[PDB]
Scaffold this active site. Structure first.
Site, PDB file in Angstrom:
ATOM      1  N   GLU A  95      -8.208   5.516   1.170  1.00 18.76           N
ATOM      2  CA  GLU A  95      -8.327   4.086   1.007  1.00 18.76           C
ATOM      3  C   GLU A  95      -9.821   3.705   1.001  1.00 18.76           C
ATOM      4  O   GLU A  95     -10.578   4.030   1.939  1.00 18.76           O
ATOM      5  CB  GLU A  95      -7.553   3.353   2.121  1.00 18.76           C
ATOM      6  CG  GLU A  95      -6.058   3.349   1.865  1.00 18.76           C
ATOM      7  CD  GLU A  95      -5.250   2.699   2.962  1.00 18.76           C
ATOM      8  OE1 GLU A  95      -4.015   2.719   2.803  1.00 18.76           O
ATOM      9  OE2 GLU A  95      -5.842   2.178   3.948  1.00 18.76           O
TER      10      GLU A  95
ATOM     11  N   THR B 122       0.621   6.845   6.118  1.00 17.30           N
ATOM     12  CA  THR B 122       1.720   7.838   6.247  1.00 17.30           C
ATOM     13  C   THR B 122       1.619   8.938   5.176  1.00 17.30           C
ATOM     14  O   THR B 122       1.542   8.620   3.994  1.00 17.30           O
ATOM     15  CB  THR B 122       3.116   7.179   6.141  1.00 17.30           C
ATOM     16  OG1 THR B 122       3.331   6.253   7.233  1.00 17.30           O
ATOM     17  CG2 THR B 122       4.233   8.293   6.099  1.00 17.30           C
TER      18      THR B 122
ATOM     19  N   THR C  50      -0.235  -3.593   4.824  1.00 15.60           N
ATOM     20  CA  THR C  50       0.277  -2.296   4.534  1.00 15.60           C
ATOM     21  C   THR C  50       0.398  -1.577   5.900  1.00 15.60           C
ATOM     22  O   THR C  50       1.127  -0.576   6.067  1.00 15.60           O
ATOM     23  CB  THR C  50      -0.665  -1.504   3.561  1.00 15.60           C
ATOM     24  OG1 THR C  50      -1.883  -1.217   4.228  1.00 15.60           O
ATOM     25  CG2 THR C  50      -0.961  -2.280   2.364  1.00 15.60           C
TER      26      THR C  50
END
Lengths: 173, 213
Positions: B80, B1, B213
């Site tokens: 990430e 997000t 997550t």
């Protein structure tokens, strides 16, 4: 650094680590607003209320909750998005429609509402301006560092913060 | 997000402010991809209170653009698991929207994202990725050019493996950096767009496997 902007950050237990995860950014002055958002079919209730709030081009702030998205949470989550957005407006004496809400983290998990309810009861205007650095940290999820930038223009200041390093290809309008 | 917020004491015309906010968003936050996974929650906002008085719309826009871009490159570098930022520069497209479509396809190719991650100058994976825009029938493989960094690797001029070998080797060098450019020209018209993403690592997989997550 911009005049009229204050930051509230606090831990509300959206994850169980005592970290600041609840943020209020607000202007002490009326502010014109521009915003763009996900057009996801699973757009969270936070998004809908933001759209409504910026429809008149007028807004003064945003509450942000990190490590829970409040998405796919049903009517319960819709209720919770409204309650939180409204309680923040009310606690700072702003009109509802001048407070946005944003939320990030896990999908399909209800807010810890009692923890958030207790914190709201204590909420008020930060003494003094600034704290974007604190906001930058309090919004993080799987970020490894806070993201913050500052520009001067024509005697005014512009500060930006951002977060998000997974679930990331924005297509916002 | 993605969550991003901007605050300024600038006074701006409300209608100019929206127009310029959108233009910058389209070139920055809407020009980045880590994993193609458009979230349920992406929010981007600018608040302008008036306190510092009037500012030129063009000066402000420029300033917002620099602020936004720096944040976007921040996000791409911090992807990430990422070790490497990937920047895809598309030019010569039919229009800007096609240049963006091709850049996205390339920067979102798992095979492109892993080749870059290994420092493997497997430019043929970028040709593949461009090739996946199979509804853009004005993209002609004969006219397309591909570079990594400042090294044009496609089309072959002359033979034979040359050439590709040397320069393959030069692509391997640039790939060792933490920021990687892939330039692509479609030789159709003047459409241009740069997009930003990152490499695909074991770290991405582990985090997102291990890892609620």
């Amino acid at each position: 650094t911009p005049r009229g902007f204050v930051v509230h950050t606090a831990p509300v237990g959206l994850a169980d680590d005592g970290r600041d995860d609840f943020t209020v950014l607000a202007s002490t002055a009326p502010a014109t607003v521009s915003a763009v958002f996900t057009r996801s079919r699973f757009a969270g209730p936070s998004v809908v209320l933001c759209r409504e709030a910026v429809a008149d081009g007028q807004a003064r702030g945003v509450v942000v909750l990190a490590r829970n998205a409040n998405v796919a949470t049903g009517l319960e989550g819709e209720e919770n998005a409204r309650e939180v957005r409204e309680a923040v407006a009310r606690a700072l004496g702003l009109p509802e429609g001048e407070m946005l809400i944003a939320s990030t983290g896990v999908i399909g998990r209800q807010y810890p509402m009692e923890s958030i309810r207790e914190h709201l009861k204590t909420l008020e205007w930060p003494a003094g301006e600034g704290g974007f650095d604190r906001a930058a940290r309090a919004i993080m999820t799987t970020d490894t560092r806070p993201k913050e930038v500052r520009v001067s223009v024509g005697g005014a200041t512009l500060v930006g913060i951002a977060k998000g390093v997974g679930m990331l290809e924005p297509d916002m309008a | 997000t993605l969550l991003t917020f901007f605050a300024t004491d600038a006074r701006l015309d409300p209608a100019e402010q929206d127009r310029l906010f959108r233009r910058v968003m389209d070139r920055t936050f809407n020009a980045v991809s880590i994993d193609t996974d458009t979230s349920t929650s992406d929010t981007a906002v600018l608040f302008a209170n008036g306190l510092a008085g009037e500012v030129d719309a063009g000066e402000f826009e420029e300033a917002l653009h620099t602020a936004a871009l720096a944040l976007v490159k921040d996000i791409a570098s911090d992807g990430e698991g990422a070790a490497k930022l990937i920047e895809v520069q598309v030019t010569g497209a039919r229009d800007d929207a096609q240049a963006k479509r091709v850049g996205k396809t390339v920067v979102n190719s798992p095979l492109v994202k892993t080749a870059v991650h290994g420092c493997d100058p497997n430019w043929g994976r970028v040709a593949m990725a461009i090739g996946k825009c199979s509804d853009d029938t004005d993209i002609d493989q004969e006219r397309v050019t591909i570079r990594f960094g400042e090294v044009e690797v496609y089309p072959p001029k002359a033979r034979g493996d040359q050439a590709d070998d040397a320069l393959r080797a030069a692509v391997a060098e640039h790939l060792r950096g933490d920021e990687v450019v892939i330039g692509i020209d479609l030789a159709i018209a003047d459409g241009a767009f740069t997009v930003y993403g990152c490499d695909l690592t074991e770290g991405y997989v582990r985090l997102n496997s291990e890892y609620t997550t």
